């Protein structure tokens, strides 16, 4: 009951450049469904040599 509310406050730090969250971090919350979906977790990637692309986050208004 906290992990959706942590994946939002780590995108609301990445799009606003706060608390040394890098702009290229992947906040990935693979949810718990109770079905054979992907393995659930909250996986934060910060390493180089990935691929990344810009969008507009509509709730804040920033890239």
């Amino acid at each position: 009951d906290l992990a959706p509310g942590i994946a939002d406050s780590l995108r609301h730090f990445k799009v606003l450049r706060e608390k040394r969250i890098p702009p290229w971090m992947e906040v990935v919350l693979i949810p718990m469904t109770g079905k054979p979906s992907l393995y659930p977790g909250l996986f934060l990637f910060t390493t180089p040599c990935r691929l990344v692309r810009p969008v507009q986050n509509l709730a804040l208004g920033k890239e």
């Binding site: 509310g5 939002d8 406050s9 609301h12 507009q56 509509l58 709730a59 804040l60 208004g61």
Partner: protein
């Protein structure tokens, strides 16, 4: 200085920073639609038929 043992704790309060309120606005802010192309003003026949 014996440091004897005690009973079992009933509950465990977890203190944590609150959710980020008033960060997202209640309406959404989309990128505006790129406009459809206009017929430009001041278009006239510049080619006259010869002779």
């Amino acid at each position: 200085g014996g440091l004897t043992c005690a009973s079992a704790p009933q509950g465990t309060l977890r203190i944590l920073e609150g959710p980020q309120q008033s960060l997202s606005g209640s309406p959404l802010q989309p990128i505006p639609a790129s406009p459809p192309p206009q017929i430009p003003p001041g278009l006239r026949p510049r080619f006259c038929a010869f002779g």
